[PDB]
Scaffold this motif. Structure first.
Motif, PDB file in Angstrom:
ATOM      1  N   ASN A   1       0.841  -1.192   0.000  1.00 52.97           N
ATOM      2  CA  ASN A   1       0.000   0.000   0.000  1.00 52.97           C
ATOM      3  C   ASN A   1       0.880   1.247   0.000  1.00 52.97           C
ATOM      4  O   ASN A   1       1.155   1.854   1.034  1.00 52.97           O
ATOM      5  CB  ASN A   1      -1.056  -0.037   1.119  1.00 52.97           C
ATOM      6  CG  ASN A   1      -0.575  -0.601   2.440  1.00 52.97           C
ATOM      7  OD1 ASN A   1      -1.027  -1.645   2.871  1.00 52.97           O
ATOM      8  ND2 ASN A   1       0.340   0.052   3.108  1.00 52.97           N
ATOM      9  N   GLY A   2       1.349   1.604  -1.190  1.00 53.52           N
ATOM     10  CA  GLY A   2       2.104   2.813  -1.448  1.00 53.52           C
ATOM     11  C   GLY A   2       1.245   4.064  -1.590  1.00 53.52           C
ATOM     12  O   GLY A   2       0.013   4.033  -1.587  1.00 53.52           O
ATOM     13  N   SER A   3       1.920   5.200  -1.691  1.00 56.81           N
ATOM     14  CA  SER A   3       1.299   6.515  -1.771  1.00 56.81           C
ATOM     15  C   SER A   3       0.403   6.723  -2.991  1.00 56.81           C
ATOM     16  O   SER A   3      -0.623   7.373  -2.857  1.00 56.81           O
ATOM     17  CB  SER A   3       2.375   7.604  -1.697  1.00 56.81           C
ATOM     18  OG  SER A   3       3.647   7.158  -2.137  1.00 56.81           O
ATOM     19  N   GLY A   4       0.748   6.194  -4.161  1.00 55.10           N
ATOM     20  CA  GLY A   4       0.052   6.445  -5.422  1.00 55.10           C
ATOM     21  C   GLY A   4      -0.676   5.236  -5.985  1.00 55.10           C
ATOM     22  O   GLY A   4      -1.795   5.371  -6.471  1.00 55.10           O
TER      23      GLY A   4
ATOM     24  N   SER B   1      12.020   5.081  -5.099  1.00 57.37           N
ATOM     25  CA  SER B   1      11.185   6.280  -5.219  1.00 57.37           C
ATOM     26  C   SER B   1       9.807   5.964  -5.787  1.00 57.37           C
ATOM     27  O   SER B   1       9.652   5.509  -6.915  1.00 57.37           O
ATOM     28  CB  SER B   1      11.895   7.419  -5.952  1.00 57.37           C
ATOM     29  OG  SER B   1      12.325   7.056  -7.235  1.00 57.37           O
ATOM     30  N   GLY B   2       8.784   6.220  -4.982  1.00 56.67           N
ATOM     31  CA  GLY B   2       7.398   5.924  -5.306  1.00 56.67           C
ATOM     32  C   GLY B   2       6.639   7.136  -5.803  1.00 56.67           C
ATOM     33  O   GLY B   2       7.130   7.904  -6.621  1.00 56.67           O
ATOM     34  N   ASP B   3       5.431   7.335  -5.295  1.00 49.02           N
ATOM     35  CA  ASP B   3       4.628   8.516  -5.592  1.00 49.02           C
ATOM     36  C   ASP B   3       4.884   9.648  -4.595  1.00 49.02           C
ATOM     37  O   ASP B   3       4.959  10.800  -4.985  1.00 49.02           O
ATOM     38  CB  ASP B   3       3.159   8.109  -5.603  1.00 49.02           C
ATOM     39  CG  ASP B   3       2.258   9.167  -6.239  1.00 49.02           C
ATOM     40  OD1 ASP B   3       2.546   9.555  -7.389  1.00 49.02           O
ATOM     41  OD2 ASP B   3       1.255   9.559  -5.602  1.00 49.02           O
ATOM     42  N   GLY B   4       5.055   9.345  -3.310  1.00 40.35           N
ATOM     43  CA  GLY B   4       5.164  10.356  -2.261  1.00 40.35           C
ATOM     44  C   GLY B   4       6.540  10.489  -1.612  1.00 40.35           C
ATOM     45  O   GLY B   4       6.846  11.526  -1.048  1.00 40.35           O
TER      46      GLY B   4
ATOM     47  N   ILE C   1      10.205  -2.735   5.868  1.00 40.59           N
ATOM     48  CA  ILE C   1      10.766  -1.561   5.197  1.00 40.59           C
ATOM     49  C   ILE C   1      10.850  -1.836   3.695  1.00 40.59           C
ATOM     50  O   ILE C   1      11.392  -2.852   3.262  1.00 40.59           O
ATOM     51  CB  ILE C   1      12.117  -1.143   5.816  1.00 40.59           C
ATOM     52  CG1 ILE C   1      11.968  -0.686   7.282  1.00 40.59           C
ATOM     53  CG2 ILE C   1      12.808  -0.043   4.994  1.00 40.59           C
ATOM     54  CD1 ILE C   1      11.048   0.517   7.522  1.00 40.59           C
ATOM     55  N   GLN C   2      10.328  -0.919   2.886  1.00 38.51           N
ATOM     56  CA  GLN C   2      10.158  -1.130   1.447  1.00 38.51           C
ATOM     57  C   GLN C   2      11.474  -1.372   0.698  1.00 38.51           C
ATOM     58  O   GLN C   2      11.560  -2.255  -0.151  1.00 38.51           O
ATOM     59  CB  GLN C   2       9.412   0.075   0.863  1.00 38.51           C
ATOM     60  CG  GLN C   2       7.951   0.067   1.322  1.00 38.51           C
ATOM     61  CD  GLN C   2       7.203   1.354   1.041  1.00 38.51           C
ATOM     62  OE1 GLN C   2       7.766   2.405   0.794  1.00 38.51           O
ATOM     63  NE2 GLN C   2       5.894   1.332   1.107  1.00 38.51           N
ATOM     64  N   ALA C   3      12.538  -0.655   1.047  1.00 35.10           N
ATOM     65  CA  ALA C   3      13.851  -0.837   0.432  1.00 35.10           C
ATOM     66  C   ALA C   3      14.527  -2.165   0.811  1.00 35.10           C
ATOM     67  O   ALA C   3      15.226  -2.749  -0.008  1.00 35.10           O
ATOM     68  CB  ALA C   3      14.711   0.362   0.811  1.00 35.10           C
TER      69      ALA C   3
END
Ligand SMILES: Nc1ncnc2c1ncn2[C@@H]1O[C@H](COP(=O)(O)OP(=O)(O)O)[C@@H](O)[C@H]1O
Ligand SMILES: Nc1ncnc2c1ncn2[C@@H]1O[C@H](COP(=O)(O)OP(=O)(O)O)[C@@H](O)[C@H]1O
Ligand SMILES: [Mg+2]
Ligand SMILES: [Mg+2]
Lengths: 370, 168, 172, 192, 316, 151, 400
Positions: free
Chosen positions: A7-10, A150-153, A131-133
């Protein structure tokens, strides 16, 4: 099996542990109608989610419940998580463990409310927050490297050496694809075109996703576009009218390398990556330079891996090989690596369980998910 | 570890790998049943002769063998009373996990420290060259494992001595 | 065990598919036979049993009266999902809109299509719809007299807590 | 072992598990040795749920309640001792013919090793209670368990034989016309 | 725990409850301790009055070393006639308590500390007599060797405080020496106890703890204890000697030093037990390493997808 | 109670080892004399420094039987003494020139040696085991597993 | 045996009761919980237990309950729990003392084996008796220790934190074929109270607050549809409970239908579970009707309650009335066939002053017996046979 929900920002990216790719991928958006609902019946709803909001958007105010990697609206985030489980994956969440994700250096309360809603609203049997990374490094087939995600936010750098993270050297930058979309709206206004609404912000996000790219040398590209038609090309709006753009195609992504274009006082993504390597102990730096791993949709620009390698080669000493790892699947590497992790047998002991949450409350996440 | 153990573990490997020519075999004394025949001994024509491989009077293998089953039992180095305690208890934790190490017995045969039963089904459902690799890698390492445990015991005896004696 | 319909003790009751078209006290238009205003009927029973029955996870169906009580029990769970945060008047208009809108009958996305029979003819389907629309409009109107019993501008929390108590893990 | 099967639908699941995995121990101290010293008796079973359960001593310990009824709370003697006490109550001239044809029947006779255990345990019970532990006459005692492949259905297969033997003999059956005039006294035809 | 408590924890918690309680209930509680010691706590005549009584096999020896004088000095007006089967007793009346929570707390502590207070009298006799010998040796340093030689036999205390330990101690003008004539009868504790007693003596030879009492060890007895009745040189005893110098029983430190030396063999016995739990975790960690060497004999196959309860799943 | 009474041991006599392996066609004093002629040759071959010919002559006959443990242990004493006196560089050239039956007898008697380390030096028997199995293969151990129990 | 008092340790799923034989209460009653850390290695020394483990969650220790559903399942944690019980709290030397331990009637052979090796090799106790736990709870029911007050026949219903089991005992013998177990006890009713506070989104739904709402607010009603209706008819049925948070501030909780619906878990276990369905009065009937015919009057005449989760207000009265209904309906089916009235049977459910800790009080009373040291395993048995000495089931019939 277990669910993996990036569940990412964008975009929400969701699916099952051991699957080759996410089978649910949709806008992290709730849309609500902004106009007079005059016809009785008509299949109308109080709000819309994901691709249903994105397809109705001409009559909806659209808002993301997540900004800069932080949940700002929990009622709409529950609406999105409900859409992942019941509409998009078509599962009982009470039957499946869920691997969730977040960016490093988030508020403590984000992890707590996220574990609380999973156990108390969705009645989940077990969950974890990665942690996503760190997830993106499993998707690389690597156990050492520095991951630029690097995602949306949010953009972040996490250096890992032989499975040890160096948490003092982790960098966060609250600049990624939504800031680049807002900047593309600001500069499209200079060529003649105004995009203003939350619906028009999705049109210019779609322009950014297929017109924009990273120049290898910005001032040469800027001079080449100022003196020729050759960099210019066009896009067709939903209304069938055509937009032509030129230097806007590489000025937008250059904000990752020059954050001062959006008024930020920070190093670009190249120099933030180098500053993270230089915060690590001197013996590990050689293997971090040889293992710069790119991730998230804001790394999908043409030329960004060639630019990132050029820029880091100027910062590092010439005596060593800089290598940028930019897989074609790096759009999903956080989710891919979450599906690896959620399928490992030691990880089956690392879950927060229902019984263990019920005994400890939502603070259990801070003393189990790192 | 294998410079001193090499001649011994080569003789164990070679004869354990010869001994694991196993087969499906149902009982001649009970109908509609099969049993590991080395473990029951009720029909002697399908037992092969028991072989001992030995480095030392204290460091020995017994290999017992049959049409459908091998029982392999070992005596391990215990040169002092600390090692007699440490070995006995380490083998009890290791045999307490025998359902997950499918070729372990739950008890050793008398006069041996640990024992293994490899049945026909294990040679069908597992890689039998990796079964004999696990046996020899266990025999190669267990002396280094036990010696490291008596270093940890020494290190704790120092922890309590220094903690006690420093609070006068 | 769970609580079954007292109306399973009735006989020669009108039926569609295998719903029982039980005697109903109501002012809505439709096919249901007028009950006595002085006695409990299936909706006084269905709401009275619901907040006990929604905790059980095992239920054996004695006949078409219980198939009717179950459809009501599942529709009370839908109503308590629809009602939250509303004024009593907004809730009456929202839950009548819910009751009236096009829904699946047994024999069509119906959640219990193994336990309920399809309509016995092309005409049995229309009498099944015209009964179930009248039943669930009355069931919505009656529930609101309980959830807005003590206060009128906010639904009672002593009824809103069953909004996630999904009877037998089924929902409409 | 912490498993649960209390639903009315799960009784057929453990019936199929028993019917697949249970066997009668021929020698209890040997199966207890294979059970307590070894993992060889361990077996996995997958329920129609997809759940997997591990079963070990229960494979011989379950059907042992036929040979030791006290395991299920009964005070009766088990199969071998119930059969022996029955033959040993027959008249002297017919005991040999009963021991030379102990006919097993029905599905609960189908456990692997049950004929072997039953024959042994009758030889062993005659050795205790007739010979008083003197080996010298044991070879002379002949017992034969009859243990046919079809024996789960021997009642049906024998009913299909008997129903043919009396098919033409219309007087052998209790008639509807005889039932409606005598009531239950019509059934007095069907033996003592 | 890395260190044992000196006081009886049950007596401390019970008296801290009853000294605060609005409504005391009756009690009848025999309570064990280390070294074969036992307590009886009861309300024998009123719920208002608690009798605490100690039973200890060496108490007759301890009375010869001035124990009743120290127990009367510590417990004062609360001292009571001994209970039948018990050596010492104290009566506390719950309506007669001190006026403050901090005086109540240090009384609940003082009564829980009773096993180490009865056993402290030979150590206070040695410390106070070392101060006499110190003053005489400060008067005439060339007479001091003869005072120390006579005090090594005339001022020696031996306490046979349990059947496998004798504590022997004496003053000399600059020290108190105490020898634990020490043994473990349980064979695994004798084997681990050899490692504990060896590493205990070698610890004192390292630079970090030179501030501690001098320690010495043997398994014949120290010269000055060889003819004490019940010491025996072939009987599997080891002999741990502590030389406390003047700095180890300075007035700021006497009571902590006494409490801490009495618990010597109890900390060693406890840590010989707790070392087994450590060895067991050391073992099962490398049972889990040997799993990975057997797991490479499992051929690789994908399992079917299952929900958290193990039920089969039908997606992906 | 009846459950523990062994009836099988008297009602169904099991196969004996002499039903599987043929009876020895020589008497105990006949084999004891045949070995007593060989042991002096095996000892004498050590003194002349020809321990390779000491084994080649000792290996020409082997005692077997449960009635002959004294002369089997005397033959094993001579066998381990002969193997201990052969130089480790001679073993590969000797093993490749042995017959399959001489190899089978060598690998059988190094196994009888390895069963009793308080009498026999295992270090030389393991060195012989490595070289005999390296040159002649795994099947020589398979022939020992399958071999007669009174060898 | 030694002349020193035996040491009694009832290690429950919720609570461990620790003490010495012949005392008028346990010396300690504290949770069966361990707080554990999650250049010398000492993290196995750093743990805490019981009330002192509950204080350590804010210091970053992970709490765990090594006993769950009645059975020990973490032997590392249970060994550390026992060493800390013996050397901190009971402050005793195992070599001087005989021990009484306990576990559920079902408990694996593996658990008694693992228990015996920790007691005889880690701690080296002089001897060990592992008792059948609710059989001790029958002995706590006596009016005094004198032989004339004993009632050696009775059903015992034990309900603690983790499991509830119904044991028939007659003339002092346990009828092991007739044991029934329901996998639901005091913890499952807490998780149900917690789940209901959480469904209302109440300010606090921590486990301690759901526990305290059982002990203070909950009771057993006759029938939940009548009692839901009484919570419409009468307004002071809803209570207000004041709770203090982990971070140290006040909160107020409205407590409602969980007051009656949560103790209903015993009388309708279909509320708690998919996997267990038979209610406690029918489950006690199944125990007595599977039991031998001559002991059935004695087993109904004395139904002893045991364990903390039987202490709900009106619990014994609901069990007695519902079991008397089952029993008289079965007797009347027979009177109506036979045409003659029976003598009936009196069903008596017994709540008593030692009911909260009946297993410990029974263990104390039975370990006081002059014969006790002859029923223990001695360490000399363990030196010959090892942990296999404890493996055979005591309560059930064994093959071999
Ligand atoms: N091909 C692309 N070129 C440029 N930007 C892209 C491309 N594909 C996706 N993006 C941008 O990446 C962002 C989504 O990336 P994602 O990794 O899914 O972010 P998040 O996880 O935070 O939701 C959006 O801003 C989107 O427009
Ligand atoms: N007054 C009470 N009313 C209801 N339940 C109680 C009461 N007092 C204690 N309990 C509950 O009893 C259980 C503990 O009982 P106990 O016999 O000590 O269990 P166990 O032996 O299995 O650990 C806990 O669930 C506790 O909250
Ligand atoms: Mg993202
Ligand atoms: Mg309990």
């Amino acid at each position: 099996t277990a669910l993996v929900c990036d569940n990412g920002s964008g975009l929400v990216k969701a699916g099952f542990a051991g699957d080759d790719a996410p089978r649910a991928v949709f806008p992290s958006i709730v849309g609500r109608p902004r106009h007079q609902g005059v016809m009785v019946g008509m299949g109308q709803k109080d709000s819309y989610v994901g691709d249903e909001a994105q397809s109705k958007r001409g009559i909806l105010t659209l808002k993301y419940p997540i900004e800069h990697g932080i949940i700002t609206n929990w009622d709409d985030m529950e609406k999105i998580w409900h859409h992942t489980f019941y509409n998009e994956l078509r599962v009982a969440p009470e039957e499946h463990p869920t691997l969730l994700t977040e960016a490093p250096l988030n508020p403590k309360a984000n992890r707590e409310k996220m574990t609380q809603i999973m156990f108390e609203t969705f009645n989940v049997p077990a969950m974890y927050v990665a942690i996503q990374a760190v997830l993106s490094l499993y998707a690389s087939g690597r156990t050492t490297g520095i991951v630029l995600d690097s995602g949306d936010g949010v953009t972040h750098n996490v250096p890992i050496y032989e499975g040890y993270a160096l948490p003092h050297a982790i960098m966060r930058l609250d600049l990624a694809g939504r800031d680049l979309t807002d900047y593309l709206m600001k500069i499209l206004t200079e060529r003649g075109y105004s995009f203003v609404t939350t619906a028009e912000r999705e049109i210019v996000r779609d322009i950014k996703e297929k017109l924009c790219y990273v120049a290898l040398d910005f001032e040469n590209e800027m001079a080449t576009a100022a003196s020729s038609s050759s960099l210019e090309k066009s896009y067709e709006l939903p209304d069938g009218q055509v937009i032509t753009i030129g230097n806007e195609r590489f000025r937008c992504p250059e904000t990752l390398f020059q954050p001062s274009f959006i008024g930020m006082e920070s190093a670009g993504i190249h120099e933030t990556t180098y500053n993270s390597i230089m915060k690590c102990d001197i013996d590990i730096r050689k293997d971090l330079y040889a293992n710069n791993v790119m991730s998230g949709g804001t790394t999908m620009y043409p030329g960004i891996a060639d630019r990132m390698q050029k820029e880091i080669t100027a910062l590092a000493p010439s005596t060593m090989k800089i290598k940028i790892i930019a897989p074609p699947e790096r759009k999903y590497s956080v989710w891919i690596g979450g599906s690896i992790l959620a399928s490992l047998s030691t990880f089956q002991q690392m879950w927060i369980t229902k019984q263990e949450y019920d005994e400890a409350g939502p603070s259990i996440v801070h003393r189990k998910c790192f | 570890m294998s410079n001193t153990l090499r001649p011994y573990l080569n003789a164990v490997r070679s004869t354990l790998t010869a001994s694991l020519a196993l087969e499906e075999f149902s009982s001649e004394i009970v109908e509609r049943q099969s049993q590991p025949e080395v473990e029951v001994g009720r029909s002697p024509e399908i037992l092969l002769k028991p072989l001992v491989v030995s480095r030392n009077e204290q460091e020995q293998c017994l290999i017992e063998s049959s049409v459908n089953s091998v029982r392999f039992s070992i005596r391990i180095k215990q040169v002092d009373e600390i090692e007699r305690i440490l070995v006995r208890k380490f083998m009890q934790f290791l045999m307490g996990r025998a359902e997950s190490f499918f070729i372990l017995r739950r008890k050793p045969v008398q006069g041996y420290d640990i024992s293994f039963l490899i049945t026909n089904y294990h040679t069908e459902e597992m890689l039998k060259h990796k079964l004999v690799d696990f046996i020899i890698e266990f025999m190669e390492e267990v002396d280094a494992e036990i010696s490291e445990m008596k270093l940890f015991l020494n290190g704790r005896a120092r922890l309590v001595a220094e903690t006690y004696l420093s609070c006068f | 065990p769970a609580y079954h319909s007292s109306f399973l003790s009735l006989t020669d009751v009108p039926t569609t598919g295998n719903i029982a078209m039980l005697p109903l006290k109501t002012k809505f238009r439709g096919p249901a036979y007028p009950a006595d205003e002085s006695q409990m009927d299936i909706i006084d029973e269905c709401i009275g049993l619901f907040r006990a029955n929604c905790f059980f996870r095992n239920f054996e169906i004695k006949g078409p009266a219980d198939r009717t009580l179950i459809y009501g029990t599942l529709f009370i769970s839908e109503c308590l999902g629809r009602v939250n945060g509303l004024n009593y008047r907004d809730a009456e208009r929202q839950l009548n809109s819910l009751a009236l809108e096009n829904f699946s009958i047994p024999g069509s996305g119906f959640p219990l299509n193994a336990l309920y029979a399809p309509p016995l003819s092309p005409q049995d389907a229309e009498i099944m719809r015209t009964y179930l629309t009248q039943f669930r409009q009355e069931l919505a109107y009656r529930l609101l007299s309980h959830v807005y019993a003590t206060e009128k501008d906010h639904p009672s929390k002593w009824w809103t807590c069953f909004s996630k108590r999904r009877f037998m893990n089924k929902a409409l | 072992k912490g498993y649960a099967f209390n639903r009315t639908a799960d009784f057929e699941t453990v019936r199929e598990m028993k019917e697949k995995l249970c066997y009668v121990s021929y020698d209890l101290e040997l199966d207890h040795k294979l059970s307590e010293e070894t993992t060889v008796l361990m077996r996995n079973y997958t329920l129609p749920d997809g759940r997997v359960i591990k079963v070990g001593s229960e494979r011989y310990e379950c059907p042992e309640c036929l040979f030791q009824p006290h395991l299920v709370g009964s005070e009766q003697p088990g199969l071998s001792e119930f059969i022996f006490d029955t033959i040993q109550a027959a008249d002297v001239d017919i005991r040999k013919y009963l021991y030379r044809a102990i006919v097993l029947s029905g599905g609960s006779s189908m456990y692997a090793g049950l004929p072997s255990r039953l024959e042994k345990e009758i030889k062993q019970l005659w050795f205790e209670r007739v010979l008083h532990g003197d080996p010298a006459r044991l070879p002379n005692f002949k017992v034969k368990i009859e243990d046919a492949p079809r024996r789960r259905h021997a009642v049906f297969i024998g009913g299909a034989v008997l129903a043919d033997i009396m098919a033409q003999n219309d007087h052998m059956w209790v008639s509807k016309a005889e039932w409606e005039e005598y009531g239950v006294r019509a059934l007095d035809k069907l033996g003592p | 725990m890395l260190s044992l408590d000196y006081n009886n924890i049950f007596i401390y918690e019970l008296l801290t409850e009853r000294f605060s309680s609005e409504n005391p209930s009756s009690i009848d509680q025999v309570v064990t301790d280390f070294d074969g010691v036992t307590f009886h706590i009861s309300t024998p005549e009123e719920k208002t009055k608690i009798l605490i009584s100690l039973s200890m096999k060496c108490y007759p020896e301890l009375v010869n070393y001035g124990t009743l004088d120290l127990l009367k000095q510590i417990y004062g007006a609360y001292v009571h006639e001994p209970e039948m089967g018990y050596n010492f007793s104290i009566l506390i009346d719950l309506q007669q308590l001190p006026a403050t929570d901090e005086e109540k707390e240090q009384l609940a502590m003082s009564i829980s500390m009773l096993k180490r207070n009865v056993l402290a009298a030979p150590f206070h006799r040695a410390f106070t007599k070392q101060a006499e010998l110190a003053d005489l040796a400060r008067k005439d340093p060339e007479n001091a060797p003869m005072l120390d030689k006579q005090a090594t036999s005339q001022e020696l205390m031996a306490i046979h405080y349990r059947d496998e330990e004798t504590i022997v101690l004496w003053p000399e003008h600059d020290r108190v020496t105490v020898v634990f004539s020490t043994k473990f009868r349980e064979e695994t504790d004798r084997i681990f106890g050899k490692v504990f007693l060896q590493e205990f003596v070698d610890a004192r030879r390292r630079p970090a703890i030179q501030t501690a009492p001098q320690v010495l060890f043997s398994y014949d007895p120290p010269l000055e204890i060889r003819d004490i009745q019940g010491i025996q040189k072939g009987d599997d005893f080891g002999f741990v000697t502590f030389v406390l110098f003047e700095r180890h029983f300075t007035p700021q430190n006497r009571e902590d030093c006494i409490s801490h030396i009495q618990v010597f063999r109890n900390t060693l016995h406890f840590h010989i037990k707790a070392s087994k739990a450590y060895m067991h975790q050391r073992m099962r960690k490398r049972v889990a390493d040997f799993q990975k060497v057997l797991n490479r004999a499992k051929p690789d196959v994908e399992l079917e997808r299952k929900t958290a309860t193990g039920r089969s799943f039908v997606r992906a | 109670t009846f459950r523990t009474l062994d009836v099988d041991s008297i009602t169904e006599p099991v196969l004996t080892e002499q039903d599987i392996f043929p009876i020895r066609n020589e008497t105990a004093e006949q084999v004891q004399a045949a070995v007593s002629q060989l042991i002096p040759q095996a000892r004498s071959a050590i003194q002349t420094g020809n321990a390779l010919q000491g084994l080649k002559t000792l290996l020409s006959y082997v005692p077997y039987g449960n009635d002959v443990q004294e002369v089997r242990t005397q033959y094993l004493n001579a066998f381990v003494d002969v193997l201990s006196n052969i130089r480790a560089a001679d073993i590969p050239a000797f093993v490749k020139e042995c017959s399959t039956e001489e190899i089978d007898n060598i690998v059988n008697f190094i196994y009888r040696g390895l069963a009793n380390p308080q009498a026999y030096n295992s270090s030389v028997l393991l060195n012989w085991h490595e070289k005999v199995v390296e040159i002649s293969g795994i099947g020589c151990i398979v022939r020992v597993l399958n071999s007669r129990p009174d060898l | 045996a030694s002349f020193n008092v035996p040491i009694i340790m009832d290690n429950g799923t919720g609570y461990s009761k620790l003490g010495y034989a012949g005392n008028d209460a346990p010396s300690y009653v504290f949770p069966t919980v361990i707080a554990t850390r999650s250049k010398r290695a000492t993290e196995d020394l750093d743990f805490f237990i019981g009330n002192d483990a509950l204080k350590k969650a804010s210091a970053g220790y992970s709490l765990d309950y090594p006993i769950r559903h009645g059975q020990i399942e973490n032997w590392d944690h249970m060994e550390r729990f026992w060493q800390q019980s013996l050397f901190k709290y009971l402050r005793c030397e195992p070599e001087d003392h005989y021990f009484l331990l306990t576990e559920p009637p079902l408990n694996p052979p593996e658990n008694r084996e693992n228990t015996a090796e920790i007691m005889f090799e880690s701690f080296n106790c002089a001897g060990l008796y592992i008792a059948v736990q609710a059989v001790l709870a029958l002995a706590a029911s006596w009016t005094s220790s004198k032989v004339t007050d004993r009632s050696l026949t009775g059903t015992v219903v034990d309900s603690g934190d983790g499991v509830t089991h119904i044991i028939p005992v007659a003339e002092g013998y346990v009828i092991g074929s007739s044991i029934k177990t329901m996998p639901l006890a005091g913890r499952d009713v807490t998780y149900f109270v917690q789940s209901l506070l959480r469904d209302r989104n109440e300010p606090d739904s921590s486990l301690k607050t759901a526990e305290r709402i059982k002990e203070e607010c909950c009771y057993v009603c006759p029938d939940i549809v009548k009692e839901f209706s009484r919570f419409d008819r009468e307004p002071d049925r809803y209570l207000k409970y004041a709770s203090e948070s982990i971070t140290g501030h006040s909160t107020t909780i409205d407590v409602g239908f969980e007051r009656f619906l949560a103790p209903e878990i015993f009388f309708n276990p279909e509320i708690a579970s998919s996997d267990f369905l038979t209610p406690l009065p029918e489950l006690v009937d199944n125990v007595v009707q599977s039991s031998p015919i001559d002991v059935r009057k004695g087993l109904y005449k004395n139904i002893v309650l045991s364990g903390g989760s039987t202490l709900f207000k009106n619990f014994g009265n609901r069990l007695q009335r519902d079991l008397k209904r089952i029993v008289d309906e079965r007797i009347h089916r027979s009177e109506m066939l036979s045409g003659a009235k029976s003598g009936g049977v009196d069903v008596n459910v017994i709540s008593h002053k030692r009911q909260r800790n009946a297993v410990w009080f029974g263990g104390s009373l039975l370990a006081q017996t002059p014969e006790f040291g002859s029923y223990c395993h001695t360490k000399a048995d363990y030196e010959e046979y090892g942990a296999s000495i404890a493996r055979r089931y005591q309560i059930f019939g064994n093959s071999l």
